[PDB]
């Protein structure tokens, strides 16, 4: 699927907190989540406090992926809205992150490939003596 192309949409009504983007946004990547709220309502944002998300499109810039996905799961489970967040490096190159196929990762969409997948039971891994003095570990054959 094509990504959703993060626009300059508005943000929630928040009075400011001490949970924002300190330096991991200035020099490293920071994150941004966008959700379409059917109505204006209050929600507990993951950086501490309580914001009021607006009707229609909302946009909230967060410091790490766990904040974004925690807020997204609370949105999808409590307000039942469809979230999708990105990762914006300090030079640009906004990376589409969460669904990665349009459908949520709990659904087995075709096309996504098997990466990080061993075709063996967990106790058939060789011992560390087999992979000693080799850059590989006991779980990468």
């Amino acid at each position: 699927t094509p990504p959703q192309l993060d626009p300059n949409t508005p943000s929630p009504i928040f009075a400011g907190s001490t949970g924002g983007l300190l330096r991991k946004a200035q020099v490293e990547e920071f994150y941004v989540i966008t959700w379409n709220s059917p109505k204006e309502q209050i929600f507990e944002m993951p950086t501490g406090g309580a914001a009021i998300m607006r009707e229609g499109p909302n946009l909230l810039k967060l410091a790490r992926k766990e904040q974004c996905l925690a807020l997204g799961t609370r949105l999808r489970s409590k307000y039942k809205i469809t979230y999708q967040f990105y990762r914006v490096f300090p030079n640009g190159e906004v990376q589409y992150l969460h669904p990665k196929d349009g459908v949520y990762p709990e659904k087995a969409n075709p096309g996504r490939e098997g990466v990080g997948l061993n075709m063996r039971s967990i106790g058939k891994n060789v011992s560390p003596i087999e992979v000693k003095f080799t850059g590989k570990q006991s779980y990468d054959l």
Binding site: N8, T9, P10, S11, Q26, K61
Partner: protein, 95 residues
């Protein structure tokens, strides 16, 4: 547009969104008198070179420290005085 109503994600102006503002950095010009400034700029330039300042501070601090400790008479610090008392015997004679 960062200056819109509750828009804080202008992607080309990513310094205002990341929080790259100088909270207190004033670009106001030199406040000191230029002659005082020239005096300090000429008299402190020898300390500007870092690799020659680290070496200088090491070999000057260690020198002053190993010197002022050496020529410290027995009035500043008592470790260089001595016992200045008859040494008392230990338990069990001395052992």
């Amino acid at each position: 547009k960062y200056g819109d109503k509750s828009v804080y994600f202008d992607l080309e102006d990513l310094g205002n969104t990341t929080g790259q503002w100088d909270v207190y950095g004033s670009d106001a010009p030199s406040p000191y008198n230029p002659l005082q400034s020239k005096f300090f700029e000429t008299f402190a330039a020898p300390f500007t070179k870092r690799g020659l300042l680290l070496k200088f501070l090491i070999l000057g601090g260690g020198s002053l420290l190993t010197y002022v400790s050496a020529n410290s008479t027995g009035d500043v610090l008592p470790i260089k005085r001595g016992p200045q008392e008859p040494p008392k015997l230990g338990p069990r004679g001395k052992l």
